[PDB]
A = this chain, B = another copy of it.
Amino acid sequence: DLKTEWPELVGKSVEEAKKVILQDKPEAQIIVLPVGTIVTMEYRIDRVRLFVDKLDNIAEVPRVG
């Protein structure tokens, strides 16, 4: 059971999300982007993109990639 998504983080702050993700995935390379940002298709097993809203809350389920 590999932890690959954090549905429990939707609506939480980016600071709380970073803390949780690094506890579950200490190698995570955390990227913080506005919702709607276009990204590439290249997969990175250690990257976790956090898509944030106007108040810097997690707006979409974080996933590895």
Q: Which A residues contact B (CB, under 8 angstroms)?
A: 4, 7, 10-11, 29-44, 46-47, 49, 52-55, 57, 59-61, 63-65
A-B contact pairs, 15 of them (CB 8 A): A10-B44, A10-B46, A11-B47, A31-B35, A31-B57, A34-B37, A35-B38, A39-B41, A39-B59, A40-B40, A40-B60, A41-B49, A41-B63, A42-B60, A42-B63
Extra inter-chain contacts (17) besides given A10-B31, A39-B59, CB under 8 Å: A7-B44, A10-B46, A10-B47, A31-B35, A31-B59, A32-B54, A32-B55, A33-B54, A33-B59, A35-B38, A35-B39, A39-B60, A41-B49, A43-B64, A43-B65, A49-B59, A65-B65
